[PDB]
Amino acid sequence: TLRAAVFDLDGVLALPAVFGVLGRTEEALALPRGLLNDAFQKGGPEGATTRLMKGEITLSQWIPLMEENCRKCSETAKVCLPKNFSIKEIFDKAISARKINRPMLQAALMLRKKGFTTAILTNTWLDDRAERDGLAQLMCELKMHFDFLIESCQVGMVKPEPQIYKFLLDTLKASPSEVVFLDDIGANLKPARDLGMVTILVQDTDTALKELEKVTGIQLLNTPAPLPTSCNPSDMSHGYVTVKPRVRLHFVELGSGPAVCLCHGFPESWYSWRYQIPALAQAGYRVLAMDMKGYGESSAPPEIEEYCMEVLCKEMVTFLDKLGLSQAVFIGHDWGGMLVWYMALFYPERVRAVASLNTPFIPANPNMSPLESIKANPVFDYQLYFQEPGVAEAELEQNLSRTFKSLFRASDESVLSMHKVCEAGGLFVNSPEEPSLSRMVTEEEIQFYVQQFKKSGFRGPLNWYRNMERNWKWACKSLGRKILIPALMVTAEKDFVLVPQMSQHMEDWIPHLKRGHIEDCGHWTQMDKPTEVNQILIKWLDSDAR
Amino acid sequence: TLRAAVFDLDGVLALPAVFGVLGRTEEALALPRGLLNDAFQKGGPEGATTRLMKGEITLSQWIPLMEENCRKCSETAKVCLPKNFSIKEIFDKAISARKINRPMLQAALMLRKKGFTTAILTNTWLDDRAERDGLAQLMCELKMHFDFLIESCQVGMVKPEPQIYKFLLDTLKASPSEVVFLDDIGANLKPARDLGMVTILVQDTDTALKELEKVTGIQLLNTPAPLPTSCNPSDMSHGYVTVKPRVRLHFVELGSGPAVCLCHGFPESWYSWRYQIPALAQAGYRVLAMDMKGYGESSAPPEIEEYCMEVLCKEMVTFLDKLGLSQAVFIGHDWGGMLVWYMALFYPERVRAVASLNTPFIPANPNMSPLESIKANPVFDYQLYFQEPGVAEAELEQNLSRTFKSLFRASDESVLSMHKVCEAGGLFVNSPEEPSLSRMVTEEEIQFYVQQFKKSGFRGPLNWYRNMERNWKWACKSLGRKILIPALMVTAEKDFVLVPQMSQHMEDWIPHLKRGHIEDCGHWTQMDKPTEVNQILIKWLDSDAR
Ligand SMILES: OCCSc1nc2ccccc2[nH]1
Ligand SMILES: OCCSc1nc2ccccc2[nH]1
């Protein structure tokens, strides 16, 4: 029966409320009780505050009208306002102190995933203060989680006028009895109640959530921690840059601040960073998540030598040049992590900082060919299977749904053994034809990868493995160098191929290397433990890349 | 006969040279003459500096080897180095002091436009210092003006080894007698001379340029000021964002720093900002030059009401939301300038600062319909001609080459009279069928606009003029507001329609408005006086938007 939930901003989704700060200001300045709240409401429907909430005047135009109201009120109360009394200073601190009420936002997100239409209906103003960016940032964070945002100053109506409630019902396409309305001001609930809406008076968050659980029948309060917010491909800004006549790179972009370039591995997509992109943008970075060469919407030339590290790194430098970026932080995973270590070794002036997930920095051995080293370790035997052009492509392209469902699994759900791949004559020889869906991915997420690989196939991606001698010869030029720019190595306890032990001598080459370690995490780090990855990257970026 | 010019970086394209700073450091610290230059070259081909220039070691690995060399040299000279002696400190200041030698860069640009292949051949290092960004920025600025950049540390060879000269000739595809080689180090010219190349020893810039003019036959020294660097559409990063199911906005992006959104007018393109985009990016801004709705690669729905200001402004806010930008500086020209004033009036929290080229802020009159005001001024008569759907489209789409050649002209080259357009029954009634090319545009630039308008035509663009009453009704809501965020109004002396006098009462609405004025400038401000626009915008951005 209930299918829509409406929340107020001030005092409900953001705490503390402005009215609460006015009461504390009166106590701190030993002013008569309610003086600032009376000046704020002076004139009712014809007063300055109603004109502000309706968008007739801006916040900066209202500030001197509110100060005049404070003086008129203090005069009738027979009191004097302190010498340094400033409405602007009081409001600046009140707005600045306001943070998202995480448990209330989590309840709204939970209701939305269960099919509820969610909205914010708020009495707010046109903020033209020099510090208005703080409010714009708060609104942008909240906005993305709600179906509708209705602000009084944009529609010319305020709560508790009954027409704003009729406007809300028309916008939601719902009858009053299907709506739950949460507000901390009792007067603002009365019109919603007259129409027949379920109302909840918000004094403390926990009691309001208990009422909300009771009326919706959905558990909201003691629920497990949700996954980080993920990307909707259709809502991203897609960028395209031609780095060479036949090569165009696609990326998705979000945020402002220092540039952070994310480099996925095999056989992945920019979409493998879906849980990191909003978190890193919200932390104050401009995120560029690439489709590496050979993948998704980036060019995929068939030639093997187009995928050697020297060419790939040169194109990443050109990518920065064409975007006008003198530097970027480079973060890679798997094949992308291999590339980011070589970007730091050959172009340190373009790399602000470097981080690798799972992939260690492995220096070339000038006495041993990489093909000889492959045979010495049965862990990397499967790479010999990837050498012959056409062989692994036919197996991997045969059934795309099976390829991604078999690969994208948690460490305890594995259906593949990377040893004896050449002996068996394939990667999926003793693997089921229809594997179960892993717990880390949904069918919808799998189908995104399937659609992306339907375009250029596996030739481009597999060609990254077919330049072993070319890469070895190139890497040998850097054997006298050290990596002396900020660097982070993140190991994954349960990675089958890139084991944490392979990273143990990295300090010899990167003396001030920082480390992160994720327990119970397999190869697909980003989607296996997204919350842990986000925390590790954000803390490192804030200390070593800012 | 000569068709390639090669320049060194240090001491030729960038001044002062490092070797010059070593000599000044010796004089300032009262060290024996040549001590630092001897330590720098200690060991010759097997020394630390050659290993640095070949890319074997990085700059940070070389610093302690150079300090050890300084001590070995001071010991044989029987002198003591001062207590605070630091090679890192000396090199940091030397690199920091180095600026582009503008007259030398201007000569290279002039040779390139006359058909010369240009290259930089330099002995340089892998810079991994914490301050390496300064060098990366210098290299990016220079890079874009040259066909090739050959760095010693990337190719493993140094000047004066003869194989780096053979490598250069192979890269240029030229024989030695077709090459002019400029360098400030005499020893580095000897191998080029042995091969038969024309060499110029650079001591002072003016004398080197006189030698270069004599040998090339091209005037380089007393030439007029060149136009700012312009965009090549194929080299830009193209971005696409879906703001609504049927509406996708295209933009080009360049640079890092605070976001600056450029909004073109009618009937233009993102390409109208071609001279501002590189200048604003080089000044430290992230430029987003839009294709406004109805234009180029942005969506162009046929419905009139899709182009009213309320809808357009709402979509620009969504554009910022999808990119993760809490704020942007908005700069508009013509119809774009109209939009940016309304962005500041309705969404001040999303607008960091606002600037308009030519378009004044004109408040709505609540007593007079905009269609009545149009008839009172014969200057705006042509807007009545744009009202009837289909009429102006057929005339403007008839011959696209004629439409753009007739419109894009300097104030003294006009072939159109905007008065009596309705009386004549068309905009081009007494206009030539094949007008001459204006001096502000080339045929190639005209053809870009022709190709862009071949896609969606003039319906979308003309629909911006067909929402007069809808826009008037919407603007009436803001009559009690003032614009109190940083604002710049730039007038153009010779604009036929948007005359500077129409902006004179703007201070009543924007009390702290800043102004710019461009003399002898017509309607097409950006391409008419690009250098003047750039200077005005950059100075304003650096003081009011940073
Ligand atoms: O360090 C290079 C990538 S190692 C590697 N990553 C893989 C992911 C999936 C299957 C085989 C793989 N082999
Ligand atoms: O302020 C709205 C645009 S005024 C206007 N700009 C034009 C450019 C070209 C032709 C007619 C024009 N009319």
Short mmCIF file of N, CA, C and O in Angstrom, two decimals, chain A residues 55-58 60-61 126-128 132-133 136-137 140 143 154 234-242 251 253-256 286 317 321-327 345-352 480-482 484-486, chain B residues 55-58 60-61 126-128 132-133 136-137 140 143 154 234-242 251 253-256 286 317 321-327 346-352 480-482 484-486:
data_model
loop_
_atom_site.label_atom_id
_atom_site.label_comp_id
_atom_site.label_asym_id
_atom_site.label_seq_id
_atom_site.Cartn_x
_atom_site.Cartn_y
_atom_site.Cartn_z
N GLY A 55 12.00 32.16 -2.86
CA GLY A 55 12.95 32.51 -3.91
C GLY A 55 12.80 33.92 -4.42
O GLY A 55 13.34 34.24 -5.47
N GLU A 56 12.06 34.78 -3.70
CA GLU A 56 11.88 36.17 -4.14
C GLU A 56 13.15 36.96 -4.01
O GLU A 56 13.41 37.82 -4.84
N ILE A 57 13.91 36.71 -2.94
CA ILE A 57 15.19 37.33 -2.63
C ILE A 57 16.20 36.21 -2.35
O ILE A 57 15.82 35.07 -2.07
N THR A 58 17.49 36.54 -2.42
CA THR A 58 18.54 35.57 -2.15
C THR A 58 18.95 35.63 -0.66
O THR A 58 18.59 36.60 0.03
N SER A 60 21.89 36.43 0.65
CA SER A 60 22.62 37.65 0.95
C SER A 60 21.73 38.87 1.04
O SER A 60 22.01 39.76 1.84
N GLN A 61 20.62 38.91 0.30
CA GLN A 61 19.66 40.01 0.42
C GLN A 61 18.85 39.89 1.74
O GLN A 61 18.35 40.90 2.23
N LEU A 126 18.03 30.51 -2.09
CA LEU A 126 19.02 30.69 -3.14
C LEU A 126 20.25 31.22 -2.45
O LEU A 126 20.26 32.34 -1.96
N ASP A 127 21.25 30.38 -2.32
CA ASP A 127 22.49 30.73 -1.61
C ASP A 127 23.52 31.37 -2.52
O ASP A 127 24.10 30.73 -3.39
N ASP A 128 23.75 32.64 -2.31
CA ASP A 128 24.74 33.40 -3.08
C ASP A 128 25.90 33.88 -2.21
O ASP A 128 26.58 34.83 -2.60
N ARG A 132 28.88 29.40 -0.60
CA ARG A 132 27.78 28.59 -1.14
C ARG A 132 28.19 27.22 -1.70
O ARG A 132 27.35 26.35 -1.80
N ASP A 133 29.48 27.02 -2.03
CA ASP A 133 29.95 25.74 -2.56
C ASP A 133 29.73 24.59 -1.59
O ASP A 133 29.44 23.48 -2.02
N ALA A 136 26.24 23.48 -2.14
CA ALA A 136 26.13 22.84 -3.45
C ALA A 136 26.67 21.40 -3.39
O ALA A 136 26.04 20.49 -3.93
N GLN A 137 27.78 21.20 -2.66
CA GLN A 137 28.38 19.87 -2.50
C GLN A 137 27.45 18.94 -1.72
O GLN A 137 27.24 17.80 -2.12
N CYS A 140 24.51 17.98 -3.99
CA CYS A 140 24.89 17.02 -5.03
C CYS A 140 25.01 15.61 -4.48
O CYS A 140 24.67 14.66 -5.18
N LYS A 143 21.21 14.48 -3.75
CA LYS A 143 20.46 14.45 -5.00
C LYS A 143 20.47 13.10 -5.69
O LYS A 143 19.40 12.62 -6.09
N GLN A 154 12.58 27.17 -5.67
CA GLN A 154 12.48 26.92 -7.09
C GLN A 154 11.03 26.85 -7.55
O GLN A 154 10.75 27.21 -8.69
N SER A 234 24.82 4.68 -18.21
CA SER A 234 24.03 5.67 -18.95
C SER A 234 24.07 7.06 -18.35
O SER A 234 23.81 8.02 -19.05
N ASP A 235 24.39 7.17 -17.06
CA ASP A 235 24.49 8.46 -16.39
C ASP A 235 25.90 9.06 -16.34
O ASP A 235 26.08 10.10 -15.71
N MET A 236 26.89 8.39 -16.92
CA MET A 236 28.26 8.88 -16.88
C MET A 236 28.57 9.77 -18.07
O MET A 236 27.96 9.64 -19.14
N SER A 237 29.56 10.64 -17.91
CA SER A 237 30.06 11.44 -18.99
C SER A 237 31.08 10.53 -19.69
O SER A 237 32.00 10.03 -19.05
N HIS A 238 30.90 10.31 -21.00
CA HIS A 238 31.81 9.48 -21.77
C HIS A 238 32.74 10.38 -22.58
O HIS A 238 32.27 11.25 -23.29
N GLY A 239 34.04 10.16 -22.46
CA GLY A 239 35.05 10.91 -23.18
C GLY A 239 35.76 10.06 -24.21
O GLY A 239 35.91 8.85 -24.02
N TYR A 240 36.18 10.68 -25.33
CA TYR A 240 36.87 9.99 -26.41
C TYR A 240 38.01 10.85 -26.88
O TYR A 240 37.78 12.02 -27.19
N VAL A 241 39.23 10.31 -26.92
CA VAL A 241 40.42 11.02 -27.35
C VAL A 241 41.15 10.17 -28.39
O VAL A 241 41.48 9.02 -28.11
N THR A 242 41.52 10.75 -29.53
CA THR A 242 42.32 10.04 -30.52
C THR A 242 43.77 10.29 -30.17
O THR A 242 44.20 11.44 -30.16
N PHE A 251 36.99 6.84 -22.05
CA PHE A 251 37.03 6.90 -20.60
C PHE A 251 35.72 7.47 -20.07
O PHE A 251 34.95 8.08 -20.82
N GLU A 253 34.30 9.91 -16.86
CA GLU A 253 34.84 10.96 -16.03
C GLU A 253 33.86 11.43 -15.00
O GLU A 253 32.71 11.65 -15.34
N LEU A 254 34.32 11.62 -13.76
CA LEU A 254 33.47 12.13 -12.70
C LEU A 254 34.32 12.88 -11.68
O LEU A 254 35.39 12.39 -11.30
N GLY A 255 33.81 14.02 -11.21
CA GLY A 255 34.46 14.78 -10.15
C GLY A 255 35.36 15.91 -10.60
O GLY A 255 35.60 16.12 -11.79
N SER A 256 35.84 16.68 -9.61
CA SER A 256 36.78 17.77 -9.81
C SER A 256 37.89 17.62 -8.80
O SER A 256 37.69 17.05 -7.73
N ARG A 286 39.20 14.07 -9.48
CA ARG A 286 38.65 13.99 -10.80
C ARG A 286 39.08 12.62 -11.32
O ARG A 286 40.25 12.39 -11.61
N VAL A 317 50.72 8.69 -22.22
CA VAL A 317 51.34 10.00 -22.14
C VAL A 317 50.64 10.95 -23.12
O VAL A 317 50.25 12.04 -22.73
N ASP A 321 48.55 14.50 -22.63
CA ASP A 321 48.83 15.67 -23.47
C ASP A 321 47.58 16.22 -24.13
O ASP A 321 47.34 17.42 -24.06
N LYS A 322 46.76 15.35 -24.76
CA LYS A 322 45.57 15.81 -25.46
C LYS A 322 44.50 16.33 -24.51
O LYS A 322 43.73 17.21 -24.91
N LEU A 323 44.47 15.85 -23.27
CA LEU A 323 43.54 16.36 -22.28
C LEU A 323 44.07 17.62 -21.57
O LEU A 323 43.33 18.21 -20.80
N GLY A 324 45.34 17.96 -21.77
CA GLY A 324 45.97 19.11 -21.14
C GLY A 324 46.32 18.85 -19.69
O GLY A 324 46.31 19.76 -18.87
N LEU A 325 46.62 17.58 -19.34
CA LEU A 325 46.99 17.23 -17.98
C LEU A 325 48.49 17.07 -17.91
O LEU A 325 49.04 16.23 -18.62
N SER A 326 49.16 17.89 -17.10
CA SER A 326 50.60 17.75 -16.94
C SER A 326 50.91 16.50 -16.11
O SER A 326 51.94 15.88 -16.33
N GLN A 327 50.01 16.13 -15.17
CA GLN A 327 50.16 14.96 -14.31
C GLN A 327 48.82 14.29 -13.99
O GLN A 327 47.78 14.94 -14.02
N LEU A 345 58.35 4.43 -13.98
CA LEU A 345 59.75 4.22 -14.33
C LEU A 345 60.20 5.03 -15.55
O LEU A 345 61.36 5.44 -15.60
N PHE A 346 59.32 5.23 -16.55
CA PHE A 346 59.72 5.91 -17.79
C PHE A 346 59.25 7.34 -17.93
O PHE A 346 59.87 8.09 -18.66
N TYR A 347 58.15 7.72 -17.28
CA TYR A 347 57.63 9.08 -17.37
C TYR A 347 57.30 9.59 -15.95
O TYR A 347 56.17 9.97 -15.69
N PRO A 348 58.27 9.63 -15.01
CA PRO A 348 57.94 10.07 -13.63
C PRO A 348 57.38 11.48 -13.53
O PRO A 348 56.62 11.76 -12.61
N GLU A 349 57.75 12.35 -14.47
CA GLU A 349 57.26 13.73 -14.45
C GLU A 349 55.75 13.82 -14.73
O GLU A 349 55.13 14.81 -14.36
N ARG A 350 55.16 12.80 -15.38
CA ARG A 350 53.72 12.82 -15.66
C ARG A 350 52.89 12.08 -14.62
O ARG A 350 51.67 12.07 -14.70
N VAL A 351 53.55 11.39 -13.68
CA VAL A 351 52.88 10.59 -12.69
C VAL A 351 53.02 11.25 -11.33
O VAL A 351 54.11 11.27 -10.76
N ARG A 352 51.90 11.79 -10.82
CA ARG A 352 51.83 12.44 -9.52
C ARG A 352 52.10 11.42 -8.41
O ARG A 352 52.85 11.69 -7.48
N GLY A 480 68.73 0.25 -13.77
CA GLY A 480 69.50 1.12 -12.88
C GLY A 480 68.66 2.13 -12.12
O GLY A 480 69.17 2.85 -11.25
N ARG A 481 67.35 2.21 -12.42
CA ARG A 481 66.48 3.20 -11.80
C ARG A 481 65.78 2.71 -10.55
O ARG A 481 65.63 1.51 -10.33
N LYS A 482 65.30 3.66 -9.74
CA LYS A 482 64.46 3.38 -8.60
C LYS A 482 63.18 4.21 -8.75
O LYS A 482 63.17 5.18 -9.51
N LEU A 484 61.00 6.69 -7.01
CA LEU A 484 61.13 7.60 -5.87
C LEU A 484 59.97 8.58 -5.71
O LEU A 484 60.06 9.50 -4.92
N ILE A 485 58.89 8.38 -6.46
CA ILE A 485 57.68 9.15 -6.33
C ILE A 485 56.73 8.36 -5.40
O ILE A 485 56.96 7.17 -5.15
N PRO A 486 55.68 9.00 -4.86
CA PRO A 486 54.78 8.29 -3.93
C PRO A 486 54.15 7.06 -4.58
O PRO A 486 53.69 7.11 -5.72
N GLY B 55 69.29 8.21 -19.45
CA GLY B 55 68.13 7.63 -18.78
C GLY B 55 68.46 6.41 -17.96
O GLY B 55 67.55 5.68 -17.58
N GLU B 56 69.74 6.16 -17.67
CA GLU B 56 70.12 4.99 -16.86
C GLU B 56 69.70 5.15 -15.43
O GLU B 56 69.33 4.17 -14.80
N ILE B 57 69.81 6.37 -14.90
CA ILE B 57 69.43 6.75 -13.55
C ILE B 57 68.52 7.98 -13.64
O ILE B 57 68.50 8.67 -14.67
N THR B 58 67.77 8.25 -12.58
CA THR B 58 66.89 9.41 -12.54
C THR B 58 67.62 10.62 -11.92
O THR B 58 68.68 10.45 -11.31
N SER B 60 66.90 12.30 -9.15
CA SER B 60 67.10 12.12 -7.72
C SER B 60 68.22 11.16 -7.40
O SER B 60 68.91 11.35 -6.40
N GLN B 61 68.46 10.16 -8.25
CA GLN B 61 69.60 9.25 -8.05
C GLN B 61 70.93 9.95 -8.39
O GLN B 61 71.98 9.55 -7.89
N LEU B 126 65.25 12.08 -16.55
CA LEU B 126 64.00 11.60 -15.99
C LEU B 126 63.87 12.30 -14.66
O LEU B 126 64.63 12.04 -13.73
N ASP B 127 62.98 13.26 -14.58
CA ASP B 127 62.78 14.07 -13.38
C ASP B 127 61.77 13.46 -12.42
O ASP B 127 60.58 13.41 -12.69
N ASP B 128 62.26 12.99 -11.30
CA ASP B 128 61.42 12.40 -10.26
C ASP B 128 61.43 13.22 -8.97
O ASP B 128 61.11 12.68 -7.92
N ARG B 132 58.78 18.07 -9.97
CA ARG B 132 58.82 17.70 -11.38
C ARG B 132 57.65 18.23 -12.23
O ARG B 132 57.79 18.30 -13.43
N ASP B 133 56.52 18.60 -11.61
CA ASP B 133 55.37 19.12 -12.34
C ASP B 133 55.69 20.38 -13.12
O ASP B 133 55.15 20.57 -14.21
N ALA B 136 57.14 19.22 -16.32
CA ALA B 136 56.10 18.58 -17.13
C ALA B 136 55.23 19.64 -17.82
O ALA B 136 54.92 19.51 -19.00
N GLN B 137 54.90 20.72 -17.09
CA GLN B 137 54.09 21.82 -17.63
C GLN B 137 54.84 22.54 -18.75
O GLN B 137 54.26 22.80 -19.80
N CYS B 140 54.87 20.26 -21.84
CA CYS B 140 53.57 20.19 -22.51
C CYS B 140 53.29 21.42 -23.34
O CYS B 140 52.68 21.31 -24.39
N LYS B 143 55.77 21.08 -26.50
CA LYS B 143 55.43 19.89 -27.27
C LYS B 143 54.44 20.14 -28.39
O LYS B 143 54.68 19.70 -29.52
N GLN B 154 65.12 9.18 -23.28
CA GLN B 154 64.15 8.24 -23.81
C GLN B 154 64.75 7.38 -24.90
O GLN B 154 64.33 6.24 -25.06
N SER B 234 40.13 17.45 -34.24
CA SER B 234 40.54 16.04 -34.19
C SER B 234 41.46 15.72 -33.02
O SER B 234 41.55 14.56 -32.63
N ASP B 235 42.14 16.72 -32.46
CA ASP B 235 43.02 16.53 -31.33
C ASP B 235 42.39 16.79 -29.96
O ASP B 235 43.09 16.74 -28.96
N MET B 236 41.10 17.13 -29.92
CA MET B 236 40.43 17.43 -28.65
C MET B 236 39.81 16.19 -28.05
O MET B 236 39.45 15.24 -28.76
N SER B 237 39.62 16.21 -26.74
CA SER B 237 38.90 15.17 -26.05
C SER B 237 37.43 15.57 -26.19
O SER B 237 37.05 16.68 -25.82
N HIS B 238 36.60 14.67 -26.73
CA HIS B 238 35.18 14.94 -26.90
C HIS B 238 34.41 14.21 -25.80
O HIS B 238 34.60 13.02 -25.62
N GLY B 239 33.56 14.93 -25.09
CA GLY B 239 32.74 14.38 -24.03
C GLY B 239 31.27 14.39 -24.40
O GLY B 239 30.82 15.27 -25.14
N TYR B 240 30.51 13.39 -23.90
CA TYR B 240 29.09 13.26 -24.18
C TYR B 240 28.39 12.89 -22.89
O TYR B 240 28.79 11.93 -22.26
N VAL B 241 27.36 13.65 -22.51
CA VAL B 241 26.59 13.41 -21.29
C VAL B 241 25.10 13.42 -21.65
O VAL B 241 24.62 14.40 -22.21
N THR B 242 24.35 12.41 -21.22
CA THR B 242 22.90 12.40 -21.41
C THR B 242 22.29 13.09 -20.21
O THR B 242 22.48 12.63 -19.09
N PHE B 251 30.62 18.25 -25.50
CA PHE B 251 31.56 19.29 -25.13
C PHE B 251 32.97 18.84 -25.46
O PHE B 251 33.23 17.65 -25.68
N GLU B 253 36.95 19.25 -23.95
CA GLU B 253 37.56 19.49 -22.66
C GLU B 253 39.05 19.59 -22.76
O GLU B 253 39.67 18.76 -23.42
N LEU B 254 39.64 20.57 -22.07
CA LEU B 254 41.08 20.72 -22.04
C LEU B 254 41.50 21.38 -20.73
O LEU B 254 40.86 22.35 -20.30
N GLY B 255 42.59 20.89 -20.13
CA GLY B 255 43.16 21.49 -18.93
C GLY B 255 42.74 20.89 -17.61
O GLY B 255 41.88 19.99 -17.54
N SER B 256 43.37 21.37 -16.54
CA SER B 256 43.07 20.99 -15.17
C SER B 256 42.96 22.25 -14.34
O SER B 256 43.56 23.27 -14.67
N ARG B 286 40.26 24.26 -16.21
CA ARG B 286 39.72 23.11 -16.90
C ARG B 286 38.56 23.67 -17.72
O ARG B 286 37.52 24.05 -17.19
N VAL B 317 22.37 22.52 -15.22
CA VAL B 317 22.54 22.10 -13.84
C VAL B 317 22.73 20.57 -13.80
O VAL B 317 23.67 20.10 -13.18
N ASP B 321 25.80 18.13 -12.48
CA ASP B 321 25.53 16.97 -11.61
C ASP B 321 26.13 15.68 -12.17
O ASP B 321 26.80 14.97 -11.43
N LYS B 322 25.90 15.39 -13.46
CA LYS B 322 26.39 14.15 -14.05
C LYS B 322 27.91 14.12 -14.17
O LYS B 322 28.50 13.04 -14.12
N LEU B 323 28.54 15.29 -14.29
CA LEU B 323 30.00 15.36 -14.32
C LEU B 323 30.62 15.38 -12.92
O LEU B 323 31.83 15.32 -12.81
N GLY B 324 29.80 15.55 -11.88
CA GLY B 324 30.27 15.61 -10.50
C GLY B 324 30.88 16.96 -10.17
O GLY B 324 31.78 17.03 -9.34
N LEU B 325 30.41 18.04 -10.82
CA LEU B 325 30.93 19.37 -10.56
C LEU B 325 29.94 20.10 -9.69
O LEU B 325 28.79 20.27 -10.08
N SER B 326 30.36 20.50 -8.49
CA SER B 326 29.48 21.27 -7.61
C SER B 326 29.33 22.69 -8.15
O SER B 326 28.27 23.29 -7.98
N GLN B 327 30.37 23.23 -8.81
CA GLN B 327 30.38 24.57 -9.39
C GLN B 327 31.19 24.64 -10.69
O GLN B 327 32.10 23.85 -10.91
N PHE B 346 19.16 31.99 -10.96
CA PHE B 346 18.36 30.87 -10.46
C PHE B 346 19.13 29.78 -9.75
O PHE B 346 18.55 29.08 -8.95
N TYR B 347 20.41 29.61 -10.06
CA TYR B 347 21.23 28.58 -9.43
C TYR B 347 22.57 29.19 -8.97
O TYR B 347 23.62 28.73 -9.39
N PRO B 348 22.58 30.24 -8.12
CA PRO B 348 23.86 30.87 -7.74
C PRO B 348 24.84 29.94 -7.06
O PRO B 348 26.06 30.15 -7.16
N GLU B 349 24.34 28.91 -6.37
CA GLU B 349 25.22 27.96 -5.68
C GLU B 349 26.04 27.11 -6.66
O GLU B 349 27.07 26.58 -6.26
N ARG B 350 25.60 26.97 -7.92
CA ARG B 350 26.35 26.19 -8.91
C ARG B 350 27.27 27.04 -9.77
O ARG B 350 28.01 26.49 -10.59
N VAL B 351 27.19 28.36 -9.65
CA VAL B 351 27.95 29.27 -10.47
C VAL B 351 29.01 29.94 -9.62
O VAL B 351 28.69 30.78 -8.78
N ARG B 352 30.28 29.57 -9.86
CA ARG B 352 31.43 30.13 -9.16
C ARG B 352 31.58 31.62 -9.50
O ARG B 352 31.81 32.44 -8.62
N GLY B 480 12.92 40.52 -7.88
CA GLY B 480 13.35 40.99 -6.56
C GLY B 480 14.79 40.65 -6.21
O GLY B 480 15.31 41.08 -5.18
N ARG B 481 15.47 39.87 -7.07
CA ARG B 481 16.83 39.42 -6.79
C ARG B 481 17.91 40.33 -7.35
O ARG B 481 17.67 41.10 -8.28
N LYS B 482 19.11 40.20 -6.81
CA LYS B 482 20.29 40.86 -7.33
C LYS B 482 21.35 39.78 -7.59
O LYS B 482 21.25 38.67 -7.05
N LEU B 484 24.88 38.80 -6.84
CA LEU B 484 25.90 39.17 -5.87
C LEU B 484 27.13 38.28 -5.88
O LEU B 484 27.96 38.38 -4.99
N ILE B 485 27.27 37.42 -6.89
CA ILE B 485 28.44 36.60 -7.08
C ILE B 485 29.34 37.35 -8.09
O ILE B 485 28.89 38.29 -8.76
N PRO B 486 30.63 36.97 -8.20
CA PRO B 486 31.53 37.69 -9.12
C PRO B 486 31.04 37.65 -10.56
O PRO B 486 30.61 36.61 -11.05
#
